Amino acid sequence: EFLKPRLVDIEQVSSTHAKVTLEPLERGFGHTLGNALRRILLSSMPGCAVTEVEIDGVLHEYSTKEGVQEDILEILLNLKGLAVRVQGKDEVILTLNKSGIGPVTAADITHDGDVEIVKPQHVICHLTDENASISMRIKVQRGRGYVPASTRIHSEEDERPIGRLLVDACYSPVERIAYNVEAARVEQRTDLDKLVIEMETNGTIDPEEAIRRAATILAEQLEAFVDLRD
Amino acid sequence: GVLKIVKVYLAVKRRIQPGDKMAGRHGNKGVISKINPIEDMPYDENGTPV
Amino acid sequence: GPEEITADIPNVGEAALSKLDESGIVYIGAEVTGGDILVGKVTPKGETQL
Known part of the structure; x- marks a missing residue:
C-alpha cells in the first residue's frame, strides 16, 4: 500500500536555471530521495x-x-x-x-x-x-x-x-543543486510531499535528462542489495 | 679550469594537497587535513557549499 | 683529458635519449619527469683493473 512519484512540470526559468518537481511522494521519502539525488547529480x-x-x-x-x-x-x-x-x-x-x-x-x-x-x-x-x-x-x-x-x-x-x-x-554539467520538500496536496490524502529540485547546469545538459540518468545510477546500484548473494 | 657551463630551467606547477600549510592574517595557522568531494561539504539553504 | 657534452652516452636506452637532440642539450618545452636526462656528459676514465 504505497505511492510512487511521477515527473511533473519543469519550470525553465533561464538557460542555466531549472526547477523540476516530483509530485506524489509518500511521507518520509522527501529527504530520502532528495539527498540521494543531490549527492549523485553533483558527483557523476x-x-x-x-x-x-x-x-x-x-x-x-x-x-x-x-x-x-x-x-x-x-x-x-x-x-x-x-x-x-x-x-x-x-x-x-x-x-x-x-x-x-x-x-x-x-x-x-x-x-x-x-x-x-x-x-x-x-x-x-x-x-x-x-x-x-x-x-x-x-x-x-x-x-x-x-x-x-x-x-x-x-x-x-x-x-x-x-x-x-x-x-x-x-x-x-552541474554546479549547485538545492532542493526543498513542501506540503503537496492530492485531492484527498492527509500528508503528501512535493520535491522541488532547483538545479543549475552550465547550459549543457537537459534538466529532465539529468534526473533520468541520476535515478538509473541509483536503481542500477541497489541490485547488489536486492539480491544479497552472500 | 671550467670549459663550458649549461644552465637549464624547469617550470613545475605544484597544486594544493594534504600536508600544505595555509594560514589567515591573524596568526591562525593550520595544515590541510583532507580535500573532500564537492558534496560532503555542508550546504546552506541554497546549495552553495562552504 | 677533458670532459665532453656529446649526446652519446655509454649503455643508455633510447627511451632516455628521446628528448635531447643530437647536440646533447635538452629541447625547449619537452615535459620531463624524474630521472630523465637533461645534458649528456661523459668523462674520461681509465685505470680499470676489473
Whole structure:
C-alpha cells in the first residue's frame, strides 16, 4: 500500500536555471530521495570539456605569443571554462582561426554540425595588432568527475609532440543543486510531499535528462542489495 | 679550469594537497587535513557549499 | 683529458635519449619527469683493473 512519484512540470526559468518537481511522494521519502539525488547529480553526471589545446607557433604554456595580450597561461585557463555539447560522436577536434584587432570570442570556432557551442559570447583572448594571427586546434572529450593533467599523463602513450599544451578537464554539467520538500496536496490524502529540485547546469545538459540518468545510477546500484548473494 | 657551463630551467606547477600549510592574517595557522568531494561539504539553504 | 657534452652516452636506452637532440642539450618545452636526462656528459676514465 504505497505511492510512487511521477515527473511533473519543469519550470525553465533561464538557460542555466531549472526547477523540476516530483509530485506524489509518500511521507518520509522527501529527504530520502532528495539527498540521494543531490549527492549523485553533483558527483557523476557525464559531460564534455576541453582536453588538450595546440597553438600554431608556441612551444610551452609559459610563453607569450606576439600580438595577443595574454600569456598563454591565461588562454588555457579561459578555454577550460568552455561549455560545449557534442551529440553524435564521443570526441571532436575543434578549430579556431582569426586575424585582426578585436576580442576573439568563442563564437569564432569553425562551425560543425554535431558540435554545438552554448555560450557564444564567451571571451577567449584579445588581438591588438592588425597583422596578428592566432590559430589553435582545441580538443574535446566525454567523461565524468575530474581528471587533472598529471594523472591523465599515466596513459600518455608516447605523446610525441612538444606543442601539445595539456589542460585539466573537469567534466560536470552541474554546479549547485538545492532542493526543498513542501506540503503537496492530492485531492484527498492527509500528508503528501512535493520535491522541488532547483538545479543549475552550465547550459549543457537537459534538466529532465539529468534526473533520468541520476535515478538509473541509483536503481542500477541497489541490485547488489536486492539480491544479497552472500 | 671550467670549459663550458649549461644552465637549464624547469617550470613545475605544484597544486594544493594534504600536508600544505595555509594560514589567515591573524596568526591562525593550520595544515590541510583532507580535500573532500564537492558534496560532503555542508550546504546552506541554497546549495552553495562552504 | 677533458670532459665532453656529446649526446652519446655509454649503455643508455633510447627511451632516455628521446628528448635531447643530437647536440646533447635538452629541447625547449619537452615535459620531463624524474630521472630523465637533461645534458649528456661523459668523462674520461681509465685505470680499470676489473
